[PDB]
Structure 1
Amino acid sequence: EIVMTQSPATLSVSPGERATLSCRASQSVSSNLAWYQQKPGQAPRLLIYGASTRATGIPARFSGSGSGTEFTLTISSMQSEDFAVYYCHQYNNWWTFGQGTKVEIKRTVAAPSVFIFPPSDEQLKSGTASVVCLLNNFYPREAKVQWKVDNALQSGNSQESVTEQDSKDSTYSLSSTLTLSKADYEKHKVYACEVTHQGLSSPVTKSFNRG
């Protein structure tokens, strides 16, 4: 019954900075609340089981506080390894989990390096003509893409995918893929990747065409 919501969805934190995550509940949970840490790939981990009691072995820079319907976890001397995802959990009724909060490295704003890649001959005989937009080592996560063709922004018939942080330098990479049928390659005459990002006063474009 009890829905629990965790805000804000994302926090950008440069190393060594203090971070604050808030958790709210549709109904009261008194103090039957806990905070877990999720490292992608591994298994979630216990951070705080009481409203504030820290479990064994967690660094003292972690601490949570709250009661009733509002709680907040906080970290004061965050290190690089602490960068992960977090969940607030309650057990005062049928227990449930919150959607969670991301935490990412903060770094210098970097404009996206954009490249486009059309199909070629071998795919025609396979009948799966496709194009790729590669955006490399951009920051922050807000960098956004547009597949464009003659009188059409080809979103809804293609897929976006993204790396994790290029953690050795903390940038992001995106490999959007556009896929069409055999005869489609010739049907459309214009093809382009367009990119927007606050390091871009105007959209960045890469393009190709038929003829």
Structure 2
Amino acid sequence: DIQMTQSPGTLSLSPGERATLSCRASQSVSSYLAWYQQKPGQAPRLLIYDASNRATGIPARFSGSGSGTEFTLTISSLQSEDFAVYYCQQYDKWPLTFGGGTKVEIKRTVAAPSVFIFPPSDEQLKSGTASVVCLLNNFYPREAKVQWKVDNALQSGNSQESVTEQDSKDSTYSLSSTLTLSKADYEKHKVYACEVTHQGLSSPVTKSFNRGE
């Protein structure tokens, strides 16, 4: 049954710029097509229905078009609150099927990731476990890389990482990386270091510290 094709799965533009979104089907669905906006943390709402019709409330800078297999949502001038995720659904053939989404993200000037490194709290260490945290704070764009060097040793499979959403006020991203070791595993090593590669600054960036008995 009709899978729905939303390219690209993300989109970075400036507030004011014109956004154009691609939805497509694996066969004709004529004009039984619907567009849904879902702001981060909210419910979705109906934007366009029957390919071209606007639900009321919805502002005129929102416009739908296309027919058959290939479809267009257009946002004439992108306002702050249009930075959201946008879905499409065909309703011409059982069963009901949904596009997989386009995220409209805010484009911005390149930005300086401040790095910060956090030593395992003695409170943690007691219970036999050790979290080293590395903070890439307030930067741009999202794609960024952080390695873990324990005594100059490259690490794999013990860290997880986490990223906020674009900040309401300066539009940047922040990022947490977390290295998780057992007490003993930790206490038999010396240098702990976070290496951060990023578009935004010179060569690779390193913050570190040592257990220093």
TM-score over 0.5 (shorter chain):
yes
Between the aligned partners of 2:120 and 2:133, the Cα distance in structure 1 is: 9
3-state SS of 2:182 partner: coil
| Structure 1 residue 3, shift from structure 2 partner | 0.6
| Structure 1 residue 102, shift from structure 2 partner | 0.8
Q: Is the 8 A contact 2:118 2:132 kept in 1?
A: yes
Between the aligned partners of 1:92 and 1:41, the Cα distance in structure 2 is: 29
| Structure 1 residue 48, shift from structure 2 partner | 0.4
1:52–1:152 distance in 2 versus 1, CA, 3 Å:
farther
| Structure 1 residue 152, shift from structure 2 partner | 4.8
1:76-131, Cα deviation, whole Å (9 max, x unpaired): 1111111111111111223x112211111222110211111121423221111110
Between the aligned partners of 1:155 and 1:17, the Cα distance in structure 2 is: 41
Between the aligned partners of 1:24 and 1:151, the Cα distance in structure 2 is: 49
Between the aligned partners of 1:93 and 1:31, the Cα distance in structure 2 is: 11
1:189–1:39 distance in 2 versus 1, CA, 3 Å:
same
| Structure 1 residue 150, shift from structure 2 partner | 4.4
TM-score (norm 2): 0.91
| Structure 1 residue 67, shift from structure 2 partner | 1.4
Q: Is the 8 A contact 2:25 2:69 kept in 1?
A: yes
3-state SS of 2:58 partner: coil
| Structure 1 residue 75, shift from structure 2 partner | 0.7
1:27–1:152 distance in 2 versus 1, CA, 3 Å:
farther
Q: Does 1:24 align with 2:24?
A: yes
Between the aligned partners of 2:191 and 2:164, the Cα distance in structure 1 is: 28
| Structure 1 residue 151, shift from structure 2 partner | 6.4
| Structure 1 residue 155, shift from structure 2 partner | 4.0
3-state SS of 1:185 partner: helix
3-state SS of 1:116 partner: strand
| Structure 1 residue 184, shift from structure 2 partner | 1.2
What stretches of structure 2 of length at least 5 have no aligned partner?
Answer: none
1:43-88, Cα deviation, whole Å (9 max, x unpaired): 1000001111111121111111111211111111111111111111
Larger displacement relative to structure 2 (97-106 or 182-191): 182-191
Q: Is the 8 A contact 1:87 1:99 kept in 2?
A: yes
| Structure 1 residue 142, shift from structure 2 partner | 1.5
Between the aligned partners of 2:28 and 2:191, the Cα distance in structure 1 is: 57
| Structure 1 residue 210, shift from structure 2 partner | 4.4
1:2–1:153 distance in 2 versus 1, CA, 3 Å:
farther
| Structure 1 residue 201, shift from structure 2 partner | 3.3
Q: Is the 8 A contact 2:87 2:98 kept in 1?
A: yes
1:111-164, Cα deviation, whole Å (9 max, x unpaired): 211111121423221111110000111011112322233465434222111111
Between the aligned partners of 2:24 and 2:137, the Cα distance in structure 1 is: 37
1:68–1:148 distance in 2 versus 1, CA, 3 Å:
farther
1:22–1:118 distance in 2 versus 1, CA, 3 Å:
same
TM-score (norm 1): 0.92
Between the aligned partners of 1:63 and 1:39, the Cα distance in structure 2 is: 18
Q: Is the 8 A contact 1:112 1:143 kept in 2?
A: no
3-state SS of 1:71 partner: strand
Between the aligned partners of 1:114 and 1:90, the Cα distance in structure 2 is: 46
| Structure 1 residue 5, shift from structure 2 partner | 1.4
Between the aligned partners of 2:83 and 2:111, the Cα distance in structure 1 is: 21
Between the aligned partners of 1:148 and 1:137, the Cα distance in structure 2 is: 23
Residue-pair matches, total: 210
Between the aligned partners of 1:153 and 1:49, the Cα distance in structure 2 is: 53
